[PDB]
Amino acid sequence: GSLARAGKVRGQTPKVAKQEKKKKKTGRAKRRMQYNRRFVNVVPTFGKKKGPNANS
């Protein structure tokens, strides 16, 4: 077929730049952070919505 469209959407996309945030965490302190998020001080709250990264 016609090869003329190649990289159409890759070059058509509006170029948004990545926003600067802090250095994340690494290693044992990251595992401590995600253990503290999920297990100790889990929220007595709207259960069965146990879908972190729930949009709305």
Binding site: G47, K48, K50, G51
Partner: peptide
């Protein structure tokens, strides 16, 4: 409501996602 969204969209393209969400609601932790 996962019940209604499953009972409506079990047939559509979003069936696997609403079944995932319904089992999440039913089983729970």
């Amino acid at each position: 409501d996962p019940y209604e969204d499953f009972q409506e969209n079990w047939n559509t393209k979003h069936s696997s996602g609403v079944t995932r969400e319904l089992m999440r609601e039913l089983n729970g932790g």
